[PDB]
Amino acid sequence: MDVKPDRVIDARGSYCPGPLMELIKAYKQAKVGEVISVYSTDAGTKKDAPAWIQKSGQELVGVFDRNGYYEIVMKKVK
Structure with a gap:
């Protein structure tokens, strides 16, 4: 994606994680x-x-790392 996106999205133990949403x-x-x-x-x-x-x-x-807190990026394309 834009991986260069600027937003606030973090989920700790949200599975999917919980942040899947x-x-x-x-x-x-x-x-x-x-x-x-x-x-x-x-x-x-x-x-x-x-x-x-x-x-x-x-x-x-594309952004995945299991060292302490995972995360994902998305380029708004709605």
Whole structure:
């Protein structure tokens, strides 16, 4: 995605992680052609995170790391 998106998206232990929705709820925060960066720790959003944007309507970004807190990015494309 825009990985260069500027937004507030972080989920700690939200599975999908729990933040899996942080994206879907992000698309509403951002706008098409935009990007948003999310994070988590549950290590679930890493898999779902890339699913939130799928519905959110933002570009599919790439950002996954399980060192303390995961996160995902999405380029608003609604």
